[PDB]
Design an enzyme around this catalytic site. Structure first.
Site, mmCIF file in Angstrom:
data_model
loop_
_atom_site.group_PDB
_atom_site.id
_atom_site.type_symbol
_atom_site.label_atom_id
_atom_site.label_comp_id
_atom_site.label_asym_id
_atom_site.label_seq_id
_atom_site.Cartn_x
_atom_site.Cartn_y
_atom_site.Cartn_z
ATOM 1 N N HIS A 140 0.663 -1.171 0.071
ATOM 2 C CA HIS A 140 0.114 0.054 0.012
ATOM 3 C C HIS A 140 0.813 1.297 0.057
ATOM 4 O O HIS A 140 0.767 2.085 -0.941
ATOM 5 C CB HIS A 140 -0.888 0.118 1.240
ATOM 6 C CG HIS A 140 -1.669 1.283 1.179
ATOM 7 N ND1 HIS A 140 -3.049 1.356 0.725
ATOM 8 C CD2 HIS A 140 -1.850 2.293 1.758
ATOM 9 C CE1 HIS A 140 -3.556 2.266 1.183
ATOM 10 N NE2 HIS A 140 -2.745 3.129 1.632
ATOM 11 N N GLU A 141 2.058 1.382 0.813
ATOM 12 C CA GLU A 141 2.897 2.555 1.113
ATOM 13 C C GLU A 141 3.549 2.585 -0.271
ATOM 14 O O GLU A 141 3.738 3.753 -0.852
ATOM 15 C CB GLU A 141 3.694 2.260 2.089
ATOM 16 C CG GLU A 141 2.826 2.211 3.580
ATOM 17 C CD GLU A 141 1.687 3.351 3.758
ATOM 18 O OE1 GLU A 141 1.956 4.553 3.307
ATOM 19 O OE2 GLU A 141 0.844 3.204 4.356
ATOM 20 N N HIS A 144 1.587 4.313 -2.892
ATOM 21 C CA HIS A 144 1.563 5.567 -2.969
ATOM 22 C C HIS A 144 2.783 6.265 -3.422
ATOM 23 O O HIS A 144 2.818 7.286 -4.269
ATOM 24 C CB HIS A 144 1.628 6.235 -1.350
ATOM 25 C CG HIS A 144 0.049 6.013 -0.928
ATOM 26 N ND1 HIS A 144 -1.070 6.577 -1.478
ATOM 27 C CD2 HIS A 144 -0.471 5.536 0.453
ATOM 28 C CE1 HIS A 144 -2.069 6.266 -0.565
ATOM 29 N NE2 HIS A 144 -1.679 5.914 0.406
ATOM 30 N N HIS A 150 -6.195 6.563 -3.208
ATOM 31 C CA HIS A 150 -7.100 5.737 -2.528
ATOM 32 C C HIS A 150 -8.173 5.412 -3.585
ATOM 33 O O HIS A 150 -8.589 6.119 -4.354
ATOM 34 C CB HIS A 150 -7.437 6.105 -1.290
ATOM 35 C CG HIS A 150 -6.554 5.982 -0.159
ATOM 36 N ND1 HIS A 150 -6.341 7.092 0.780
ATOM 37 C CD2 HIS A 150 -5.463 5.292 0.145
ATOM 38 C CE1 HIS A 150 -5.378 6.954 1.618
ATOM 39 N NE2 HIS A 150 -4.959 5.905 1.128
HETATM 40 C C1 3PQ Z 1 -3.766 6.818 6.955
HETATM 41 C C2 3PQ Z 1 -3.626 5.607 6.040
HETATM 42 C C3 3PQ Z 1 -4.153 4.595 6.874
HETATM 43 N N1 3PQ Z 1 -4.069 3.269 6.025
HETATM 44 C C4 3PQ Z 1 -2.854 2.438 6.511
HETATM 45 O O1 3PQ Z 1 -2.148 2.882 7.351
HETATM 46 C C5 3PQ Z 1 -2.688 1.275 5.697
HETATM 47 O O2 3PQ Z 1 -3.842 1.136 4.731
HETATM 48 C C6 3PQ Z 1 -3.769 -0.299 4.200
HETATM 49 C C7 3PQ Z 1 -3.007 -1.329 4.426
HETATM 50 C C8 3PQ Z 1 -3.199 -2.302 3.649
HETATM 51 C C9 3PQ Z 1 -4.116 -2.633 2.700
HETATM 52 CL CL1 3PQ Z 1 -4.122 -3.921 1.764
HETATM 53 C C10 3PQ Z 1 -4.994 -1.445 2.327
HETATM 54 C C11 3PQ Z 1 -4.718 -0.327 3.153
HETATM 55 N N2 3PQ Z 1 -2.014 5.363 5.736
HETATM 56 C C12 3PQ Z 1 -2.082 5.335 4.759
HETATM 57 O O3 3PQ Z 1 -0.803 4.978 3.966
HETATM 58 N N3 3PQ Z 1 -3.074 5.748 3.763
HETATM 59 C C13 3PQ Z 1 -4.202 5.982 4.771
HETATM 60 O O4 3PQ Z 1 -5.226 6.135 4.292
HETATM 61 ZN ZN ZN Z 2 -3.086 5.065 1.917
#
Ligand code: 3PQ
Ligand code: ZN
Ligand code: CA
Ligand code: CA
Ligand code: CA
EC number: 3.4.24.82
Length: 209
Positions: A140-141, A144, A150
């Site tokens: 996920h990171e 980004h 998202h």
């Molecule tokens: C604030 C937050 C919160 N989300 C997380 O920390 C982790 O989110 C996910 C992890 C794994 C999967 Cl498969 C899907 C989602 N940080 C970020 O990077 N985006 C966000 O909206």
């Molecule tokens: Zn995120």
């Protein structure tokens, strides 16, 4: 063929908990994340390659924003100016046992800046190691870092269509094994690379871990 030469960092808390098994654990987590980045649903696959591994430094605390910024400032000092130097890396990812938090809750599991993969001053991500799903948070990171939004964002609505099962869902949910990346994610990484922002991902690393 695209290769992300990756510095993986683990903090003292990771070392304290995982002990002798930490290196193997980190490589296992990163192998799973790498598998996601080769899945055809991403449209433009990239090879996530661990080239350096540091077991600890940066200031790690509850604030996800502060921890990301401290880590990203610190990692710059380990890098070299030129990508042709074998010590150079394209992205830096920190794993910590610290409970990372936002402004109101500690539900967050990580943070990264967006669309920065070939900017050595900004190509950074942090992950709270939950012990089981850390490869999904890493993916996920890194999503980004590759300019992905998202899946509930306004631009993704029109790209995904009307019919939260992907890596770029805003919160972790069960990921569809046939489609870890949404059409929105695929479009954004593809545009990012098509537009030249992956210019540092063309050299093949000599000594993967
Ligand atoms: C604030 C937050 C919160 N989300 C997380 O920390 C982790 O989110 C996910 C992890 C794994 C999967 Cl498969 C899907 C989602 N940080 C970020 O990077 N985006 C966000 O909206
Ligand atoms: Zn995120
Ligand atoms: Ca290189
Ligand atoms: Ca947290
Ligand atoms: Ca490179």
């Amino acid at each position: 063929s695209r290769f992300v030469e990756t510095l993986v960092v683990a903090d003292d808390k990771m070392a304290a908990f995982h002990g002798a098994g930490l290196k193997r654990y980190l490589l296992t987590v990163m192998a799973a994340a790498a598998k996601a980045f080769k899945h055809p649903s991403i449209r433009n696959p990239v090879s996530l390659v661990v080239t350096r591994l540091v077991i600890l430094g940066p200031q790690v605390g509850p604030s996800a924003a502060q921890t990301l910024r401290s880590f990203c400032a610190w990692q710059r000092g380990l890098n070299t100016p030129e990508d042709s130097d074998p010590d150079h890396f394209d992205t830096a990812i920190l794993f910590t046992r610290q409970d990372l938090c936002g402004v109101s809750t500690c539900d967050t599991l990580g943070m990264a800046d967006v669309g920065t993969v070939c900017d050595p001053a900004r190509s950074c991500a942090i992950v709270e190691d939950d012990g089981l799903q850390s490869a999904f948070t890493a993916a996920h990171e890194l999503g980004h870092v590759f300019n992905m939004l998202h899946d509930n964002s306004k631009p993704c609505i029109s790209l995904n269509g009307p019919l939260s099962r992907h890596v770029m869902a805003p919160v972790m949910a069960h990921v569809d094994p046939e489609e870890p990346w949404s059409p929105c994610s695929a479009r954004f990484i593809t545009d990012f690379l098509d537009n030249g922002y992956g210019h540092c991902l063309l050299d093949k690393p000599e000594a993967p871990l």
